[PDB]
Recover the amino acids of this structure.
């Protein structure tokens, strides 16, 4: 078996899911809210 | 110039007094130049050969020991002192020239003083 | 402005070059002091100008160990006329690039820029080699970065082994390391570098080769800066004797390496050099650490045998290092720390196999075509063209045409390959191993295989 | 070393900073007794704070009671006369030790690089010392207190636009009255703690580079630990200072001041000789000499501008007056000029003292005007005086 | 030529802040 | 009497060093005549002459472009295709790389050994490279074998077999390649930078693809990929060296007959699946690696955007350097000067990556763990400075260096053929050197300031870092250091 | 690391491996690569299969045999009787060392 960190380093992921308990993200590619 | 000993006798008295004060401690005039005063001196001192810097440091230690003891050099030692034999001024001038050349062409300084 | 898919309006377009341009002819002018200036006009808008010196580590013995590579690092530093800072700024003002290379028998200094900047390039290059200031702080900095350049040497097994078997294969000047030990560097300084350079950098030992400039302009700029150089009578390069030898550094661990080498003729002797090059192509091989791109040597004897019949092999190929009067032909190898004996057996068997005559005409034509295409393709580059001009005028003074080399390649039969390989392996071998050498066989056992 | 076990207790985290900044701090071995006045200044500050805290337990900051509470300390508090005389003469002692400190700095060029920030902090500390001592002198509410308060609070009137507004804001009214005294007393309790903090920052800035020495050279090769060598050296000066201070306290308690402050404040009459303490006399002479109110305030501020600008002037690389004879003579002239200015300040405003004060202030400013040109000229000494 | 514009911007800021702390409308 | 100034050893050394310094005090003017450290913008449109680049469009939309050098003894001929990982789907991702592995695996006429024996019998070389938006197959051969190489390329593109056993063997080769994604950390850092910066867009996918996709790859997958993407209007045949335009055109007309002619067009593909930038970061913390490597990037410009030239000039202004460069302390780039003067990195490199609808502009650095804070400060300072203070000398020097590098790198038949193919795919034309130089010299200091204020000032950044990076500043500190509050 | 400082012992070690082939060429001083792999379990496996009673001698000078046996027997008699293994065979072949 391969540990999760090694797999993450070896396999770039363009479909990243961020934690959503405190904040919900804007849709990807949205204009910045600066 | 008025600071020329050969042309001006006041400069002759000044040079004689400075030489006599330096000779009492075995110090060269270039030994008064402190690396902590400017980074140009520090760089010039770092470019000098090791034996010269060791001789400078030994003279500084001897002078500090004399000053702490309220003593001067013995007259036999004072007779062999060369207070105005230079080892630093040419290298300092070269470092200054290189610094100015860097500034004229818009390059970053090779070293800078820390803000206290 | 306008998008890059639309042509820019109001641009003055220069007339196009002809689809067939007549090649130019090398002009070689010799100065009374013995300095030779060569150039060829080129259609592309790039100029490559170099200075080539027949100095190297074969002149360090006995009191200048490490001087050549230090001089390589000290290239294009402060001169008597310009500071390092000013020289870097002049090179960058015209978009130039500098380079220096140090070898056992040659050093070079090159600058590359657009051909409109030839006077600046020539001026900066000669100031650099004629007037080094050799300031102590600059030498000390280049000596600290020499320690790293020598410590990271163990990270390249091929290079490390190559130097090591040069040391273990000769006795005289050729045995002097091209990467001096750390003890040998605590003696080097600016005075030593000046004394070494003044002795060896003479006009009759130096060539100014410029690919991509008219000879008139190059002469006009370079003549007033090199004639002052005095006439120094032509000495003789020292003699080196090829012997046998073994190199062994038992470091332990894993990933052993080796290189078995033999002696071959030098650049002088112009039918057998070729026999060595075509042999190197015939054995061929590859690094076995990466893949990609057919036709790089996947179907040579070394590759097709080792990497397609015996697994667990990390590297296997052939090398060549020819000097003026001698050379080194050998075979690399990585294998596995306990598979080392089998690996050396395989390599020796392959040398013996081509020695006997077990190679068919198809492989001979394949290697012959590989040799010819490798030589013709490597001349696509302007840099290589200039360097070849300089090296050949230093060695022969003529710049022999490539056509003569092409005929020698196409005059090679199997009987030649057979007799040359038989002669090469009938002489003492140079063995070198690096890594875990405990399981690696002795020198006598490997020598008895041939 | 791997610090598994505890070695000497001074190197433990409980006392490592006090061991490194106070006990083991490297110090040039050739420091003279001239380098013992910073510690004397600190001890004077501590004496002032302790005596003032215990004096504030008996003083009333009200115009109907301040004078009488000061007399009640002199007369009724057990040990009260000693608390007062120590505080009053302590103030003069602080100024003596701080003047000697400053002139030590000027003779060795201690202000020069790399210690410019030390000198600027020192100047700020001097300003704080002046404000603190002035407002403290107003608390007794005698004749000198009241009229001295009336002038320095009017210095803001030199400002054209808001000057009168600033004067009446500082007064808390249209005259020097109870509001002025109460706010002075509050400021006078607070300012010494700001002085303590400023002194701490001063010492830290100095310890970034260490102390300059009487040769003015780099001293790394002959440094020694502050304790016990410079501890005992400073203790000699502390005991001598104690003898000096005791002479002033016990045998000449009032000769440093004026008898006029023993008269209760009278806003109607005015003393014919309104002077400040002796330690403000040179400043006050430089003020009286200019014949324009604004020009006087400008000159007073120019004094501190000149002090602050001294470290930053391009100069020669030699520090000590020991090897700069011309700068040495300029020093001995400046010191005589400052003693002349102080004497002139005590003199009434009448000939010939007006012209003498004008010339003396001119010479004071010439010192600072001439030092940079000397540095620029002397940068060429090593080329000129060869072997 | 940006330091001058920065100086002008910060001068405007300093003036705005002055009129804002002291608010001298009864004096102008 | 004092000793004379050569008796004591230290006095003698002082005399020697003083004499050397006096030697340097007097320069020789014969060697100070031509070179100047001040950069001057020069116009040399005379030497800029080059052979004509002929472009012919076939009736099916195929383009043939040649650069003839009949004095050459060699040639480079190849196919440049507007295809790559960006134009696949999520479930097809990785197919282009698999095809790159499988394309030299044999055809109806030729078997693997025949193909290798034909090529290396003439001493040729066969190269295949695939990227996110571009794919190229080309041959380096002698002048005689141009027709043979074109036949080889047309055969492999049109008549590949894709045997099932060959597919299964390549499947395990590629699976091991995925399992061995190490040792090339630059490539890994850039892959993760693309993945986070272009999250949820086709540009964010890796060329390699996921392991399940390569496990699922079959013959019909590859055939469908070639049918969908390898179409006449998306392909450019480029030749440089000893080649005649007319012979190449005739051979291409003869050989490239059974193409796909699918109506799928690259502009529409980019339009319906656009690429956008997402400010974000991925931090791969591994405290056993000896060196840290990270990249910081802003959203850049597309190929055809006029600001791309200014971004190239700006990249030259930032520069690149490693510890083996002799004169990093003296170069025109202030970032390189800071790094080399304070020894705060092993390597630094500014990159300007362009795509059809977006780009990446940023800096890649390798350094030790304890240098990271100062290195990050320096990188951000010098990048943000482009929006505030640009000297005419720096931009002039960068223009000169960029023109020089563009012309100097263009040596050999292979770089010329690659330039022709790339330009025909990205610009629709080969931009003549004079026009490119004219566009470059239109980038002045004010242009650099405007472009920097559009792309760098107060802008979101993408970070990808690996190694001992605990002291690399967090996203908020990099984001704050994109503007200066003193202006 | 502090072994090259003694050329005598360094050469004496080097010529053992340069002259013999097999077990006697195994260094007594291992390189600083086999050390990163040495651990307590590898040493426990080495000792259990080598430190056997038939290869052990308990020798005493200055002691009476009787009470020496009295103390030693209860602490050693329970060691298993294992067969004697043949000594690994080395071969002198001759060879050359070198290091610059
Ligand atoms: C004055 C007040 C200062 C009081 C404290 C001074 C302490 C100090 O640091 O002095 C060093 C002094 C000597 O010790 P040192 O550190 O070895 O000496 C350092 C010098 O560099 C050693 O240098 P040196 O060996 O060359 O000796 C120089 C020394 C002595 O120099 C001389 O003797 C010079 C005399 C030469 C000429 C003599 C006349 C002949 C020619 C005639 C022409 C000229 C005269 C004109 C006509 C009259 O001169 C001074 O240091 C005194 C300078 C002060 C000038 C006076 C200005 C103020 C006067 C008006 C005030 C109102 O210290 C001591 O005496 C040691 C005791 C411990 C110190 C206790 C300090 C506690 C403070 C007490 C409370 C504060 C009051
Ligand atoms: C706790 C103190 C330890 C002690 O007794 O003193 C030591 C030496 O004495 C000191 O270092 C104490 C000095 C304290 C500070 C003295 C400086 C006074 C100067 C003050 C100047 C301030 C003036 C201005 C005031 C406003 C003893 O020598 P040691 O290093 O062997 O100690 C061993 C270890 O601590 C036990 O495990
Ligand atoms: C008037 C200007 C004259 C300045 C030059 C005169 C002195 C030059 C010659 C000289 O230096 O001789 C020293 C005495 O000079 C001296 O004694 C220095 C005298 C300097 C006088 C001050 C300069 C003028 C100041 C004007 C502005 C002042 C107002 C600002 C406060 C020797 O002396 P030595 O042999 O004893 O030393 C060494 C003992 N080892
Ligand atoms: C008190 C309330 C006043 C409100 C505004 C005051 C100034 C606010 C901006 C100044 C500021 O934060 O700038 C920093 C000050 O730096 C420094 O300390 C050195 C920079 C030199 C000072 C220049 C600052 C602007 C002048 C403002 C004075 C006028 C105030 C009038 C209201 C540097 O921040 P950075 O982002 O530029 O540095 C990034 C480089 N890595
Ligand atoms: C004949 O005539 C004369 C005398 O008569 C006898 C003299 O005695 C003297 C000698 C006196 C001196 C040399 C002193 C001169 C210099 C100064 C500066 C004196 C000191 C002046 C002051 C009293 C200044 C006092 C300071 C204040 C009132 C500060 C007020 C404000 C405060 C406390 C805070 C400010 C508020 C804020 C910033 C708001 C927010 C605050 C927070 C902390 C949060 C002279 C010259 C003289 O000619
Ligand atoms: C509250 C008053 C002050 C205290 C307690 C104080 C304290 C100290 C102390 C302890 C030192 C280090 C030891 C020494 O050399 O004396 C020192 C150094 C110094 N102080 Fe002060 N100081 C005060 C005021 C000033 C003032 C007003 C100045 C000048 C404007 C000044 C300038 C300096 C300088 C330049 C040094 C460095 C001296 C040298 O290294 O030679 N100080 N101070
Ligand atoms: C926190 C510390 C201090 C407190 C609480 C304090 C308190 C007092 C009080 C209550 C008085 C009025 C009684 C009297 O005049 O004797 C006074 C007077 C005075 N204080 Fe302070 N003080 C402090 C520190 C200082 C300092 C540091 C100085 C020196 C700069 C100073 C200088 C004076 C002066 C000059 C007087 C007038 C003395 C007189 O003539 O009677 N005080 N102080
Ligand atoms: C080598 O360098 C050093 C010097 O230079 C050469 C010195 O001259 C001195 C001696 C002088 C000192 C420490 C001056 C005193 C320190 C300051 C900041 C000046 C005024 C200090 C005051 C008023 C102390 C008030 C602070 C308190 C009470 C803090 C609370 C702490 C406690 C109650 C324990 C020391 C120790 C020194 O090492
Ligand atoms: Zn691959």
């Amino acid at each position: 078996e391969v540990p999760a960190t090694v797999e993450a380093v070896k396999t770039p992921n363009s479909k990243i899911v961020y934690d959503d308990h405190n904040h919900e993200r804007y849709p990807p590619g949205d204009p910045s809210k600066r | 110039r008025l600071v020329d000993p050969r042309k001006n006798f006041l400069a002759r008295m000044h040079m004689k007094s400075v030489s006599n004060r330096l000779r009492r401690y075995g110090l060269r005039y270039d030994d008064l130049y402190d690396p902590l005063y400017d980074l140009d001196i520090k760089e010039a001192l770092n470019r000098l050969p090791r034996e010269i810097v060791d001789a400078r440091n030994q003279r500084l230690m001897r002078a500090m020991d004399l000053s702490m003891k309220h003593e001067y050099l013995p007259d036999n030692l004072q007779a062999v002192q060369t207070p105005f034999r230079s080892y630093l001024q040419d290298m300092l001038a070269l470092v200054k020239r290189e610094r100015a050349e860097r500034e004229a062409l818009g390059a970053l300084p090779l070293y800078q003083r820390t803000i206290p | 402005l306008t998008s890059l898919d639309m042509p820019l309006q109001g641009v003055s377009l220069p007339p196009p070059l002809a689809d067939k341009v007549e090649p130019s002819k090398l002009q070689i002018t010799t100065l009374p002091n013995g300095l030779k200036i060569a150039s060829e006009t080129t259609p592309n808008p790039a100029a490559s100008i170099g200075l080539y010196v027949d100095c190297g580590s074969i002149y360090e013995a006995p009191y200048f160990h490490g001087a050549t590579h230090l001089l390589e690092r000290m290239a294009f530093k402060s001169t008597l006329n310009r500071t390092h800072f000013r020289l870097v700024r002049e090179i960058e003002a015209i978009g130039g690039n500098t380079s220096a290379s140090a070898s056992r028998e040659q050093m070079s200094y090159t600058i590359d820029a657009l051909k409109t900047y030839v006077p600046e390039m020539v001026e900066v290059l000669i100031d650099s080699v004629r007037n080094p200031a050799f300031l102590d702080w600059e030498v000390n900095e280049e000596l600290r970065k020499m320690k790293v350049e020598i410590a990271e040497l163990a990270k390249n097994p091929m290079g490390f082994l190559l130097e090591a078997i040069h040391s273990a294969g000769y006795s005289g000047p050729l045995a002097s390391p091209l990467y001096a030990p750390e003890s040998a560097l605590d003696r080097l300084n600016g005075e030593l570098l000046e004394e070494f350079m003044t002795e060896n950098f003479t006009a009759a030992r130096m060539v100014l080769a410029a690919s991509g400039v008219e000879h008139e302009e190059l002469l006009k700029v370079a003549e007033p800066l090199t004639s002052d150089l005095p006439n120094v009578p032509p000495q003789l390069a020292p003699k080196s004797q090829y012997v046998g030898g073994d190199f062994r550094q038992h470091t332990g661990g894993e990933a052993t390496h080796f290189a078995v080498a033999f002696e071959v003729p030098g650049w002088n002797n112009e039918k057998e050099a070729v026999t060595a090059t075509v042999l190197q192509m015939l054995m061929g091989g590859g690094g076995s650490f990466s893949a990609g791109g057919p036709g790089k040597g996947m179907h040579s004897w070394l590759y097709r045998r080792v990497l397609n019949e015996y697994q667990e092999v990390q590297s296997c190929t052939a090398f060549t290092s020819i000097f003026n009067d001698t050379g080194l032909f050998g075979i690399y190898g990585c294998s596995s720390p306990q598979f080392a004996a089998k690996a050396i057996e395989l390599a020796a068997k392959e040398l013996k196999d081509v020695a006997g005559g077990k190679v068919n005409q198809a492989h001979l034509d394949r290697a012959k075509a590989a040799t010819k295409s490798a030589v013709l393709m490597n001349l696509e580059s302007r840099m290589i063209a200039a360097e070849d001009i300089g090296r050949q005028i230093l060695t022969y003074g003529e710049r022999k045409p490539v056509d003569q080399f092409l005929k020698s390649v196409d005059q090679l039969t199997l009987k030649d390959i057979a007799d040359f390989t038989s002669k090469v392996i009938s002489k003492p071998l140079t063995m070198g191993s690096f890594g875990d050498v405990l399981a690696v066989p002795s020198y006598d056992t490997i020598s008895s295989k041939f | 070393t791997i610090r598994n076990q505890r070695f000497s207790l001074l190197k433990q985290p409980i006392s490592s900073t006090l061991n490194q900044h106070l006990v083991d701090y490297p110090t040039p071995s050739n420091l003279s007794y001239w380098w013992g006045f910073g510690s004397l200044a600190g001890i004077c500050l501590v004496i002032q704070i302790v005596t003032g805290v215990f004096l504030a337990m008996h003083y009333t900051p009200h115009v109907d009671l301040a004078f009488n509470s000061v007399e009640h300390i002199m007369r009724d508090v057990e040990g009260g006369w000693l608390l007062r005389y120590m505080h009053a003469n302590g103030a003069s002692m602080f100024f003596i030790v701080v003047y000697l400190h400053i002139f030590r700095g000027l003779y060795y060029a201690s202000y020069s690089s790399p210690r410019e920030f030390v000198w600027c902090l020192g100047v700020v500390i001097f300003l704080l010392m002046i404000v603190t001592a002035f407002i403290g002198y107003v608390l007794p509410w005698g004749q000198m207190s009241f009229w001295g308060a009336t002038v320095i609070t009017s210095l803001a009137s030199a400002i054209p636009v808001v000057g009168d507004t600033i004067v009446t804001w500082l007064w808390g009214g249209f005259s020097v009255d109870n509001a002025t005294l109460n706010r002075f007393f509050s400021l006078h309790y607070l300012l010494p703690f700001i002085l303590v903090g400023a002194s701490l920052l001063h010492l830290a800035a100095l310890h970034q580079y260490g102390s300059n020495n009487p040769l003015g050279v780099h001293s790394e090769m002959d440094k020694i630990a502050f304790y016990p060598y410079f501890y005992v050296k400073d203790l000699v000066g502390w005991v001598a200072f104690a003898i000096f201070f005791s002479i002033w306290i016990f045998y000449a308690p009032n000769v440093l001041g004026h008898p006029d402050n023993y008269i209760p404040a009278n806003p109607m009459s005015t003393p014919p000789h309104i002077v400040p303490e002796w330690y403000f006399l040179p400043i006050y002479a430089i003020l009286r000499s200019i014949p324009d109110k604004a020009g006087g305030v400008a000159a007073i501020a120019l004094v501190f501008i000149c002090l602050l600008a001294l470290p930053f002037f391009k100069s020669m690389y030699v520090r000590s007056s020991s090897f700069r004879p011309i700068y040495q003579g300029m020093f001995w002239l400046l010191l005589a000029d400052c003693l002349l200015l102080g004497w002139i300040g005590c003199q009434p405003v009448e000939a010939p003292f007006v012209t003498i004060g004008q010339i003396s202030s001119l010479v004071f400013f010439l010192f600072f005007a001439i030092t940079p040109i000397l540095g620029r000229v002397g940068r060429g000494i090593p080329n000129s005086y060869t072997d | 030529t940006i330091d001058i514009q920065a100086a002008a911007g910060w001068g405007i800021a300093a003036a705005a802040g002055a009129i804002w702390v002291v608010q001298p409308f009864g004096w102008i | 009497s004092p000793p004379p100034p050569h008796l004591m050893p230290y006095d003698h050394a002082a005399e020697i060093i003083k004499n050397k310094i006096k030697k340097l005090e007097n320069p020789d003017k014969r060697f100070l005549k031509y070179a100047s450290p001040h950069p001057i913008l020069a116009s040399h449109n005379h030497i800029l002459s080059a052979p004509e680049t002929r472009v012919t469009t076939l009736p099916n939309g195929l383009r043939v472009a040649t650069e003839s050098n009949l004095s050459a003894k060699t040639a480079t001929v190849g196919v440049w295709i507007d295809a790559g990982s960006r134009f696949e789907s999520d479930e097809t991702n990785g197919t282009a790389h698999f095809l790159e592995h499988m394309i030299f695996k044999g055809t109806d006429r030729r078997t693997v050994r025949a193909l290798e024996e034909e090529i290396e019998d003439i001493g040729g070389h066969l190269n295949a490279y695939t990227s996110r938006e571009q794919t190229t197959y080309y041959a380096k051969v002698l002048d005689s074998n141009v027709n043979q190489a074109l036949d080889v390329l047309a055969d492999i593109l049109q008549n590949s077999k894709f045997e099932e056993q060959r597919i299964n063997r390549e499947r395990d080769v590629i699976l091991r390649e995925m399992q061995e994604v190490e040792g090339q950390t630059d490539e890994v850092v850039l892959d993760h930078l693309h993945a986070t910066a272009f999250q949820y867009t086709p540009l964010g996918r890796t060329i390699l693809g996921p392991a399940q996709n390569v496990k699922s790859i079959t013959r019909e997958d590859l055939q469908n990929y070639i049918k969908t993407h390898y179409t006449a209007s998306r392909m450019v045949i480029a030749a440089a060296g000893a080649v005649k335009h007319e012979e190449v055109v005739e051979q291409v007309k003869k050989l490239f007959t059974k193409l796909s002619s699918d109506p799928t067009t690259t502009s529409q593909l980019v339009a319906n699946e656009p690429a956008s930038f997402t400010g974000s970061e991925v931090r791969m913390i591994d405290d056993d690696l000896p060196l840290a490597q990270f990249a910081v990037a802003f959203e850049g410009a597309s190929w055809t955007d006029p600001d791309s030239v200014a971004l190239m000039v700006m990249q030259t202004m930032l520069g690149s350097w490693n510890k083996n460069v002799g004169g990093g302390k003296h170069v025109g780039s202030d970032l390189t000067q800071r790094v080399a003067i304070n020894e705060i990195a092993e390597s630094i490199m500014a990159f300007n990556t362009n795509y059809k609808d977006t780009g990446l502009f940023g800096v890649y650095a390798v350094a030790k763990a304890d240098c990271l804070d100062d290195l990050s400060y320096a990188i951000m300072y010098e990048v943000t400075k482009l929006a505030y203070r640009v000297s005419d000398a720096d931009v002039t020097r960068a223009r000169n260096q960029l023109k020089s590098s563009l012309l100097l790198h263009m040596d050999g038949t292979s770089p010329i053929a690659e330039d022709i193919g790339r330009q025909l795919l990205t610009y629709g034309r080969r931009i003549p050197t004079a026009e490119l130089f004219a566009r470059i010299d239109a980038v002045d200091a004010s242009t650099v300031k405007r472009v920097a204020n559009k792309y760098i000032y107060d802008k979101d950044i993408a970070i990808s870092a690996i190694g001992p990076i605990q002291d690399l500043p967090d996203y908020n500190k990099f984001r704050r250091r994109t503007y200066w509050n003193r202006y």
